[model samples]
Target chain A: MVSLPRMVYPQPKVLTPCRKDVLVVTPWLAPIVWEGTFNIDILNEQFRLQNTTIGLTVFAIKKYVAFLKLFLETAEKHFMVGHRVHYYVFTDQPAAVPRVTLGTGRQLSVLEVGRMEMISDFCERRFLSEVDYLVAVDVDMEFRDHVGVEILTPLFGTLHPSFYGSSREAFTYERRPQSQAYIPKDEGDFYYMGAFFGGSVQEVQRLTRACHQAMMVDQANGIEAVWHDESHLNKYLLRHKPTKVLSPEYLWDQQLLGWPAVLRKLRFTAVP
Target chain B: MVSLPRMVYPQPKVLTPCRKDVLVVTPWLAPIVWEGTFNIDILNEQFRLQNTTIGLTVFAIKKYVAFLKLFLETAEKHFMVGHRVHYYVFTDQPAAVPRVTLGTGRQLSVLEVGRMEMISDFCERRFLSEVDYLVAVDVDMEFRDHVGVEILTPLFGTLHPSFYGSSREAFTYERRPQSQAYIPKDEGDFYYMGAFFGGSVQEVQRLTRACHQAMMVDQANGIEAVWHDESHLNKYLLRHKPTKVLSPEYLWDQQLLGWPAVLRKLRFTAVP
Candidate 1:
């Protein structure tokens, strides 16, 4: 059992809704959130102020909701206030899932799609319709405090075609050895994680468009690989020159053994 | 940083003065707590209704007022209704440390002692004076829930000499060459975790009484291990069988990975 802290909302301020050029996506699981065992405070807070959007491609809804709630909450706490929050919630059984209420008076949009092949098409068609900056993430993550859209915003602003996330060490890349994903050469690449990644809207559109075609071609050839969405994104970024390469500190996962000193240096805690 | 849960008090409670059976010992750094970076809301909530006395042992004293202020807030929330909260706050300069005041009618006793070895003397004195239980813990730890004491109360009620903690994997402790403190055989020994532990009044008295003799014997041999307090306690418990062993779920280290269902069955998360 975890102990509670005293609530210190000394000067309670009503947060004003703000919008910028960022889009946030997450998968949904109605069972976890609806059951109320999960703490969705961070997600509630993020949806409260940021113009944030959530997206989900339903594989395992339970795992997705757990990740989405945590990631959204983390983003809300650390990201810049003005960024627009767009949720591209994807699912096969759209009617079966409950309606998601992102508290900033924004409603969750549902997309119907199947097979890993449709991940690129779903994002390319729906996500590209609105936001200037598109950030994509799997639903297994909770957000860290400091690494918000601000960090990614600047990176996306300067490096339009580039993709960014923390290192595999920090962001926890889950794939086999023969998966042909970018294995960081040293600690630097190790920090470049792909689990939570973002880039400019046009750049994301171009990449997703290309990926949609490639995945379709692969389906025709009867060849499939793990990390279909992540692999396609990684391959496109590798081919197209990216704007900037960020540190693994921006995105964190469970594999990294954190140093107390490093946490102090970062002035933030990595949320799982 | 990890976002700790906020604490809530059910009703206004007063600390009732009573003969304490437990002395909560926390080893800490003064500067960090005084810096206003550390929070103790959870700690206060756990001991809120208890009549047990609390003791904070520090390596040094920097901002005395700030330290006392935080300590008092904790007391008021937990055990300050009519109880006597004693602060056996140790520091390098005993004269400089000031007395703490409890807002809710409780008396605060401040004691300044020198040397870590003096803790053994302190424990022995408390034990001989009829103290019931001595709980040893690190200062960075915050007791957020009441399960720690509740678990011990039942075990101690059954007149156990000492109570240790065990996780689900206790039954699967087969011979493993890779373990650092692995017992040679299944019946050899149970791994004693040093994070948080407790024993009865007579048990602690006996343990500290033996420590008094051990220190004298060590001085004769000119050998000392400053951190041997826990080790000595463990050695004594081994000699006298404990009546009960608590579960890891009762007192989990928030910093470490939790006992998931998989680890309980396979006894391993990943192979080295």
Candidate 2:
């Protein structure tokens, strides 16, 4: 690794806990990305210096393709600015994708045919060669504010806007042991939103592949998880924990969750 | 990334606070590795499946070379038993190095060189090619129990036994801002022991190179940090946080800090 050049910033004070009002880190040590937890200038330099390439995978199929125009345009204004980014829009209709101008180091590829989550087989190998990290996000969503490198990690899951304040028992994890994606009511850290999750190329591939396989097993058993792919995602992340757990700021529904004081920056949210 | 095979371990309970007694994760999200937080069987399979190679580096310079015999013998009995281990012993006296039998897939290399800390210039490139992860340790220490793949991470620092319970104000960080290793009285994390600190080859190389360079700068300014290499190590880890932080169990001085109920396993400790 190339050593970093001298840079000055405010020293991290041990006494100043991150989000004194809430839990900022998981029991297993995965960082919960909040507004004040990181120094973006420092993290920006870290990723930029590595020349890290981020691949954002989104699925816009059937009637959902209508959201592409606003999604792509807003993304250009936010998402991983100044860094290398590859937006892989996996859609049934590539012709439906709008032509949104990208930054200097960013590019978009329309990968025809896919689901919102079953991103396993060919995509992993294809994207592995193109990106250092894979950010799997929802197509029906839009970037609101800055969603930058601070959210990047080996593995991550965004908190559900509706459930961030709920206790473990309140989490809507697949509870039936009959399903492969089952997580007991007693077992869960956070109720991660299905709309967003990501990690390093290698880790994202592992997460996607595992989740896909689990869904097939559930289907074979003639059982579908309560939240389908999201249920399986929760189960997979439970056993193989995420390296980082994003705060509600990354993925929120302002109309539903409202602009709480906790969320200083609403980065990515529902278009509705 | 290789997908993990089905692992059926007890479900990690959300209500169960690790150590219920202490902080198990850092504010930055680095897991402070305590016993009961990990299932070794799962971690073992993860590392072994990748065919991960671990390099244990130790300095046996000057009179310190005498510690090599017992150290190597005890290591053979307790250190990374099943995994591939490359023991890199750096000493001034090559012939003085102990003749210790190693397990299958394990080998020892006597690099006739230096350091309890300043391991930058030549060692980084040398260790990079041979090992996936480097565990820089103290030659004066011996493994008391099992020290396995659980400690492995991209970057890590062992907590000093005595300072594990100390508050931020009590931490002995260098108070002078003029020095590169300086941390104001209000700013500090757990005091990391200099005896054991390492990471993935790339990260460890970055750490050693940065600390070496920082020490050089401090020397140029005619200021030596209070704890010398340890001070610089704390500073480096502060900015570039460790992926995992070893609980004092990994680097304890049993005589000074008597074993308590909190520490379930004393895997590695000082000879005294």
Candidate 3:
């Protein structure tokens, strides 16, 4: 059972959407789950009932660990409150992992590993049994607003804030035919941000496995994706559609993307 | 784990939101959970893991049973697919209940009861142990789009299609000061539809219990809510905020409201 907010505001009308032309939900009936698509009060209950656990995987290979304090603290404030959250920090410097205090039902695990191999290894090992859903994100960013179970579908990819409004042809998908990350001009649902993406443990496993295999193939072929893992992610999601596609709200670079009217809340973003 | 969709579409740019100021999410950290808010693939996986069971309660007193076939059939085609669902039909004519075939992990149970007492009775009785959540709805309505676990929360109230755009003062909340359903002109988040409202078993029990108790008080005082159950529901939700406030997409009347530009997909609605 989820706890009620102590002071409730008059439900704002802006919270209720006023548009109809846009397909807010998908054909299969899953809500595309955009900003106004849900009420937290509703989503919190559903996830809390399951005692939902979200495993957030981030790579802090170098100075990126410097961003961990703000990221973890902000996440505690906004990301998946009232739910069990496990922060899987994959880095070379385990001692550098921040000592940010976590709420009850929340935890942090520091693992030393290579960035490219971390997700794949953990998916098969501990993450499989430990968490309900795994959200792999870049450690170089911070959470600004609520980023919680609403994004916890089996498979999801965040729209690259830079490419959300760009034409498919303008998308920076891998063009190399020899590489597994190739996408033709006519292809693609959206350009997904590699900085943030994940789903259920199995789907994340499948995603990490596929991306790893693709990266290996790319390495063997003497060709790397333009955006590395991100390139491979776009190609995979192109073939294997994500259940939910996150808005730029989930992954924004405020300095580059500024505050645009399209974004209601910048939940997670690059910490430049 | 949720399965990927077999067919694919060129990820349309329209699918990606263009506006930034218009909030896609809410301040309370709950996702408004509209169309683009989620991906079914991801949500499907999350719901499947918990083996989420959605118990839909509908009333078919007399002629309303005539609407049950189409309602049930449409619901079968659009409601809570790939998840466990139980339909509880409250009707005076038990034999009149249609013998509609349900999909796997779905079942139906008919209970003999009067219109007003049905929901209150079940909330206190077996529904608590039988299902994880209960969605009480009108039998005269049909699902026009996908209505799944996305709408499942501790407590939720769907926006009435008629009053979604109206200001709080324009809302038809019980205006009499002596009435339990009376809401001051300044109050109201959004006008919720009585035909559709639900939540987790306990929350639903709390809501139904509160509403029933209020109605009894109103009866003793020689008063009735402006809209009967709907008025009491409004008052209850106002005092105790809903975890999620559903968009008009969840409950609409194509005949009354027609198709408006604001509504992207009408999930459940009245049969004209």
Candidate 4:
């Protein structure tokens, strides 16, 4: 006979929505954030003089356009009103890039760089000068309209610094040098989060410059590993202290849960 | 540098909730459901039916109580009004066992038996009773309140006579009848999801009994094997055609997904 195992049912409790105040930044290939074919007519007349289309091939431009369309559709739902929102397009040639923007009357800054280190350079130069809290996001992500910027406001005054993303398990830094363990041995449970991240402008600038310096040092010494930017950033964070750990629910990855499981467990709660 | 796998967003159209009609069943122990101590209270009763308490040991009663508590919590949230719910408790002495009930005011039935063979017998009996659908679940499951039953309803009412479970990869047949190939071929997949299962009552009864009878015939002629009831049921379902295949999300093991994943994905949807 098969023996049954023991089970328990804890009384259900209501969950408070935990959202973070966020500003999404997308690093894209071209100026035109439009979908469909490249509108060469608009490109030539409106943005050609801006020199935004310099390094972009047709394929790369098309890719950025697709990303922009998706980003716009996803972000409008929850971004805060009058919140300091900015999208820094780090490219040496920003002339032909479409003037796609979000949240009227807010600052939108684009920085130019001559080398691949442009991302680090852009962060070091402009992050503190532009916004108090900056969110680094990939262009390909889709935003659920239900999640608002207000949900994230509670995270701002938290005691410890926090990074937001779907899974900290995805953060890779074990491959890095042993000199960089951030969380204390007793609190080693806290580590890296991925894809999207948030922090104060001062903290972000300090961390970004430090990480960029590490990468530049590695490149100068001819010791390039994998993950040029993201890897170094993760390594630094893991070695440094973070105030809090964000749950994976904030940025869900559909692929991890898959279709059937997602369907069975899907439920909707009223927005508070 | 860790090169992250590209994030692929599934088309929103493919997402659907699990069928709401899927009813979960859990076996209950005698003592706890009625609120009483095991050996002490029963032995102290007037009838002095001490022998009946043999099967009502502390372990069995405890297991049953745990299942009942979890079942009630889950049922109140997910089970549709007027849905048929059954809890099968296999015990040698039926009269001594405490009766299990439900608050949903739906049909709640119990099948009491001593040996594992009676499982097949009870299953056959239910099938012959003209029930429309039936689901077999292990007692050790605690469902999150957010999961809705609607997601599973569409899976039923199909034209084909079939069984639905997470997998067919690891189904087992009776160990007897060495000549007949105890586990038949053509059972596809990597693993048979054995945690819980559902199917048309008549069809599952027919298939389960056919295999049960075959095993009985072998046992009559002095052959016996270690295959459990679920194993036999699995073997039967594998070779036969199934109308649909459910994903692992339908009955995810708690150890695999953890508490947060369960809360996020499997919370119960209130029944209408």
Q: Candidate 4: give the TM-score of chain A.
A: 0.54
Q: Pick the candidate with the highest TM-score.
A: 2
**Which candidate has the highest DockQ of all?**
2
Evaluated on CA atoms against the true complex, candidate 1 attains a DockQ of 0.01
Residue lDDT tens for model 1, B1-272: 11123333221101110111111110000010011111234333333434454333333345433344443344355432433334344554656554554554344334554332455556556633533344433323333322323323211111111222232233232234332112233231233444444455455445456655654565576655333444444334333434344333323433345444311211111111
Candidate 3: interface RMSD equals 6.6
Predictions' DockQ, in order: 0.01, 0.15, 0.14, 0.01
Best-matching candidate per lDDT:
2
Ranked candidates (TM-score, high to low): 2, 3, 4, 1
**Would you list the C-alpha lDDT of every candidate in the order shown?**
0.36, 0.79, 0.75, 0.35
TM-score of chain A of each: 0.53, 0.96, 0.89, 0.54
Q: What is the per-residue lDDT of model 4 for residues B54-125, given as tens digits with 9 covering 90 to 100?
A: 010011233454454555456545543233444444433445444445554344334443322343464565
Interface RMSD of each: 25.3, 5.6, 6.6, 24.6
- Model 1, C-alpha of A191: deviation from truth (Å): 7.4
lDDT of 4 by residue, A36-60 (tens): 1122222232222222111100111
> How many angstroms is residue B33 displaced in model 3 relative to the true structure, after the best TM-score fit?
9.3
Q: List residue ranges in candidate 4 displaced over 4 A.
A: A1-62, A92-96, A99-101, A115-125, A146-171, A176-194, A259-272, B1-272
**Model 2 agreement with the true structure over B174-259: per-residue lDDT tens digits:** 87999999876665657888999888888887788788888889999999999998999988876676778888878777787788
